[PDB]
Amino acid sequence: MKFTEIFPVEDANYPYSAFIASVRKDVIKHCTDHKGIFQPVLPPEKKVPELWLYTELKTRTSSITLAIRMDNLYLVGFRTPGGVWWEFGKDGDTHLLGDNPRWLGFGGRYQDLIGNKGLETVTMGRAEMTRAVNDLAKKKKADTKSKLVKLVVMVCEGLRFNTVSRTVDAGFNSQHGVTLTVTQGKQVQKWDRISKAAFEWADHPTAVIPDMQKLGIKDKNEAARIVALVKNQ
Ligand SMILES: Nc1ncnc2[nH]cnc12
């Protein structure tokens, strides 16, 4: 239950880099040092998550609160200014949130938000993220998918990958915005697997793992500079 330092998205005086930095520091307070594994290993998964990361994003005009589960740096939902909670999911699923919330209608996976398509297409940046927040706070009750998917890569994958927090910070104030490279996306969509190989590599640092080979990742060394935070078991 750690509340994140507010991130003034519209205020160009705050870097994207600090936001991330600040958050990981918070997150890490809860990770464990595993042998042979470079990166801090996240809290172990539980059907009902224990530790949560409440990270609010505010603009000149509005703000929303992000509900992310630590165990796997996944965005479970958000909060509108008026105190309403939207959770990824359909009627019948089980809730994890947080004060009477209203199933968003769709899950929060890439296939769900933009199936068959690659992260290289989701455009991101301070602007895009400002557009996103304001737009998502003006929500009552599907172009709020394209809005969530930006925050998903910007915030969630930014927390998970150095490779993302670097390409995003570098192009955050770009007019044309910033997008990941084909390869990055693929890699980003394989967080789960890279992580598993981080464990595999702790045991056999030598083992060649075609899945990582197939992603442009040679060894545990290369993966270490890509992923910041790892997963499980
Ligand atoms: N909603 C989400 N939050 C964090 N990471 C994700 N990867 C795919 N969907 C995600």
Curated annotation (Swiss-Prot):
Q: Which SUPFAM superfamilies match?
A: Ribosome inactivating proteins (RIP)
User: Which keywords belong to this entry?
Assistant: Cytoplasm, Hydrolase, Plant defense, Protein synthesis inhibitor, Toxin
| EC top class, as a word | hydrolase
Task: Just give the chief location class.
Answer: cytoplasm
Q: Where in the cell is it found?
A: Cytoplasm
Which residues of this protein are catalytic? 157
Tissue-level expression: Accumulates to high levels in seeds.
Question: Which E.C. number(s) belong to this protein?
Answer: 3.2.2.22
Q: Which Gene3D superfamilies match?
A: Ricin (A subunit), domain 1, Ricin (A Subunit), domain 2
Pfam families, sorted: RIP
Q: Name one GO molecular function term.
A: toxin activity
The UniProt function text for this chain reads:
Possesses features of some constitutive defense agent. The coordinate Opaque-2-controlled synthesis of this protein and the major seed storage proteins (zeins) may provide the germinating seedling with both nutritional benefits and protection against pathogen invasion of the surrounding endosperm.
Indicate the family of this protein. Answer: Belongs to the ribosome-inactivating protein family. Type 1 RIP subfamily.
Q: How does it assemble?
A: Monomer.
Under which name does UniProt file this protein? Ribosome-inactivating protein 3
Query: Species name for this entry?
Result: Zea mays (Maize)
